[PDB]
Symmetry: C3
Subunit: 496 residues, 3 copies
Amino acid sequence: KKARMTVDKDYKIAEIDKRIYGSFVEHLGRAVYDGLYQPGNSKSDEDGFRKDVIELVKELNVPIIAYPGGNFVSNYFWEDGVGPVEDRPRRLDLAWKSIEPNQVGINEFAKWCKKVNAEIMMAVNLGTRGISDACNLLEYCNHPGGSKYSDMRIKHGVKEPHNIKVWCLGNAMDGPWQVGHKTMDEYGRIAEETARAMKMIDPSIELVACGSSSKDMPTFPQWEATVLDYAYDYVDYISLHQYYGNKENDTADFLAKSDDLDDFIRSVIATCDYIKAKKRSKKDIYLSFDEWNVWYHSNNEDANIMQNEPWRIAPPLLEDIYTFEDALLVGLMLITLMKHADRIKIACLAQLINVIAPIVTERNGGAAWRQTIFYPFMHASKYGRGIVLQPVINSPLHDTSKHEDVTDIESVAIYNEEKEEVTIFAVNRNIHEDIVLVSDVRGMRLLEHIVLEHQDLKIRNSVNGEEVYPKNSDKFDDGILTSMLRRASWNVIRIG
Amino acid sequence: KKARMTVDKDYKIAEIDKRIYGSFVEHLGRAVYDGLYQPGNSKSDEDGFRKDVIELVKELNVPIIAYPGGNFVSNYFWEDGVGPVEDRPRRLDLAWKSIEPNQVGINEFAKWCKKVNAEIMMAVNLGTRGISDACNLLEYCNHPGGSKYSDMRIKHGVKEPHNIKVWCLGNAMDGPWQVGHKTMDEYGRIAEETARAMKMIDPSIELVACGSSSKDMPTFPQWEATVLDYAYDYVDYISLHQYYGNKENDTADFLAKSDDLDDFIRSVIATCDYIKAKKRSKKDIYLSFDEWNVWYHSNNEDANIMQNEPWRIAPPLLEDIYTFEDALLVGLMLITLMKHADRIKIACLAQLINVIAPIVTERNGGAAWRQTIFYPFMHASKYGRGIVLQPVINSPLHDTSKHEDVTDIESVAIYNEEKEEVTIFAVNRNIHEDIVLVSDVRGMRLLEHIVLEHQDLKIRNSVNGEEVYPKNSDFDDGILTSMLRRASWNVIRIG
Amino acid sequence: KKARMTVDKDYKIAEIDKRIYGSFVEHLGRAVYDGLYQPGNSKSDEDGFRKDVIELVKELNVPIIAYPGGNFVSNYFWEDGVGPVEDRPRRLDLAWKSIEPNQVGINEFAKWCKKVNAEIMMAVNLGTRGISDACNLLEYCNHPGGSKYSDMRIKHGVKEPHNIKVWCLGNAMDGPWQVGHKTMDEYGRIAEETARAMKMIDPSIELVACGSSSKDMPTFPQWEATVLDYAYDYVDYISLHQYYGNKENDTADFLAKSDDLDDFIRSVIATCDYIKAKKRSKKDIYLSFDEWNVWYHSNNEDANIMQNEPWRIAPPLLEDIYTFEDALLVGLMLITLMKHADRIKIACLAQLINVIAPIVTERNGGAAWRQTIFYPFMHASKYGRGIVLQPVINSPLHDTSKHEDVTDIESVAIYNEEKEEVTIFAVNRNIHEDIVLVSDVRGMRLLEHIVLEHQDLKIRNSVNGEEVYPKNSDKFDDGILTSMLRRASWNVIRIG
């Protein structure tokens, strides 16, 4: 019933990189086609982009979006998606057994990102292509003009370079389901050489080396160590991928899964710091969590489409319909991410549109709507720009199914000294009993207390109405912030 | 004196896979140009195909043909051989030091394979190309339409996909004479990733991984083990290559070399079975004997065309003219292939037309004749489909200059249940004494007893006529008695 | 004061291969553009070649010229430099942060090599390209016709094949500044297979395997050993790179650095013969010393041009202006090369035009003048064709700051049996004392004593006049030569 945390400004973690509120669009399912891009639609614009989708993205204020994959990138030929659209070919997308029509390519997607106030984090193909092709694409995007590929971009209609700031050296390739699968030293060598070459063309870019496809691979985390060992002096980030599912239908354990997330982040840092000592380097590899979400609902329908109905265009893949308990675990993951904002400078919600996404448009031109997970994200990205304060918290515990000593209240404070405000993000992961959590504000005025609750953990949103939406309204005035957060709740208590 | 055999239909070995009667055409010498393809010739059809060759091929009944290499494929660019013929380039063929005009490519050779009732086994270049090129070729050949390379095929005039069923992951690259030479780990890695990507485009194909170039390579059989260890769950066959010759003209030792072939097959099976336990797999790798023949006659001649007359188009390379004793070895080799039909599911007599071949056309535009080796192959492909019963044989034994305890008789029974026939193939490789064969059929009415025999082992065939060719020869109750002339091939039948 | 040698015409070392007087033109700085190739110049022929530049090269009697790199080749795409000039693209040159216009390419540079009576020694890109592009280019240059790339050369207006005799399998790729950098095992395998395939196209070419980028790399000499261990049977040469500098400004220690050159050559020979024993081969690998010179003046300026002013065409990179002491080390190095003529069969002064060069043209279109180092190379290339005899010399030794027991008089004698003359090359690298050179010629009349001396060890040349030049100055009875050698002098004594 009683849980307590000291809040000290003078005990920071770090400042938040706005790029931790990033997302991800893969040429996958209906993310692009019958997704953000619907050229005939009445809700679309000059370029065929759905204007309603643009606004919901803008509501999320995402600064950076990873593109174009993902597994799709490992067998993608960027030239296929540029130039006169009537000459762009159709290709087999081996990853998702689909036909890519390439109507959207680099320059279309670059426009879309401007309209949503975002920047591209661009992946290159290092599965079936290599060094010279990454150099070609980089020059096309970033070099002003006067050379083969920059002039060819100008010719395609983009006079100024896109100047993409962050690039991913391929996509994770440790798995047998991935075209262009590599051993960890193979990937290490090609990542090193691509990054060396790319930095000669544009030394102001930042480079992400790929980690394991998941923490469960037998090659994690040696893969991460081997790659950094080769490429350390040319790369700035390593990537983590993590998804959670509630296929066991065990809401107790499900929301304890953010503790495995904390374990995972820590050992990736440990691996980074080990290679740092080995190189005697002053640089710190930063973490780029470029794939994270809840993902389990649409598993079976997805393996029916592949391979019973393969080589369709924009099949309805990975269409998880999210519940309210999912939006809790999403908020728990965001808290865990903010709590590690000293090393995690990029993170991408996978994915942005239609595909395990917070934004859905109905098939065949349908309307757009917000999934449950839309809201815990929109809060974090809105009230989360500031400085993380260390979490010194005493909160009761509980066992769950297959997790022990599991905290009942996870929380983090963010002090925007910039324009006086402290925001507390807190989740009661006890699904039974409410708990009252106050906060010894040792420093600094109760603003509001937005909440996200429902008695039906399995309720969903839909094009016919949101059953999960922020309601500001709840229960401090002295120096000792007193709040009680209902069981299975997500709250953003603000203080000014 | 006599040799005894029991044959009974309950004691089976395997159903012969019909693809052990396939063959092989490389862009090599006169196999294609001045061979199966002579476009302005009175004997060729519109497409340019010698019809006498087309008809000779159909007599062999070969259901699958390996194309287009062989060493040639290790530096071939398949785009050179498709589309507007006027626009195809001439390329240096480094394997055989020739010029390749590329008038025959995929769509031509596919057309020709229709007219001989045969399928293609397609090799891709993994010598100097890799994954994405194999994926383009497979898409071009097997994807229906609606994609860049499927459409490009349609646009080249083949509306329906060739739907090739078996592919070869490169060609043997373990040798210092080959372009694109690899170590065993390089090849394993490249075989694995090509196989994986190919099965995503068309999961219905079968894939062949290349063995050693020959069992005499120091890296045999570790190459086979390394490749299958990498590629096991993505490939269906491992390949074998064997050739024999008689440069030391010792006909007895020569005819004993089928014992070597058998040992080679067994060693490859054990290698497969070892890696299978390593993987804890329920799957067996199957064997593809996609290069086998007699090969030695033309060696000096080919060494003079290389290196004194390079960069010809259609030089007469590898033009072995086979003797009667070569046909005997080929017959023993087929019998051995038949005895291992439980693991060997594809085999390719190398090669089909003019190049170490059973079908010949005389240089510069006309001939078409049958070599000595033509006939034991034709018989086997004819009366060899069915189920192999194992041989329960006790036959006399002899030594030779380099072999010990060689059976004087070697044989095998094939029972086509859809014909209530049981064909027996036997070679008496006692080159001196004849032998009579007692075959306790526990069946089950004789229909014929074909034979291939000649007094001089060194006799050849020619455009002038066939000195060697099948003739007739010579069962009552539970036994059938058949005498086998010394140094002879025998096809005996039951009904 | 006294330091002597005997000169027996049959204590022989070996005959001189004239290709040890070769050189090197890279697409670097002003070597080509605004150097040997200036189209609208009054001093240029109709093909845009500077005529005075042609004359000075012909003066140095350079039989073979390495082209087009150097680091440049490791990202070069040869197709960009052939066919109609208007269809040639501009490329980023990652090695030297320049724009490469490709107005000169291979067919132009083959024409210029005719005009200077030299042959191309051709390097193929093994950095970002491999076997099949080496074959393409070899076929283009050396195949008569009737195949795709030979007919493409014909159709570009060169009917006869260039028939290039010596190819370099890439360039040094052991350095972290090099595009396409490779481990020694990666390089040895691609050199092995490229050589194998090229020898099948043209068995009469010779091939050089690349050695270490310098003797200071931690991987030297194992790099050389590994690559020779893969490719022994398909290659004829291993290459060495050497540069010296005088940033310490210790003119005594400076001129003793030719002792280090000598130790270095011996190291590479020892490595070769170790691999010979290992292969049980009858063949000796010969040495291609395809990069040597003094280089250190322009270091600071060069680092400014990149990256302060990157992506210029023909920036003034590596425009060392050499002093007289620089020319004595060049003469001491030429003497050391001659002494190892039994193994060293090719050598390239790096480089020929403007880029650390003996021939300079003033920026923006006109000059042509000879640097200090022009003359010792000019002498050695002219009188140093013959047979190297073993120098048995007793000379006083001195110490220097970093060297011990350093010879005062470095000498060697070349005997041309045709011309009945014998040429002796000698350098007094004692900068203080004067010394005499008798020379017991156990041959057996005097004919000349050409000399390079100067008061100022730092005097340079310029477009305003050659402060350093050969003077028929200086002044043999029965069969005993005797000649005096001033401090810090280069002397060429001739007997006939």
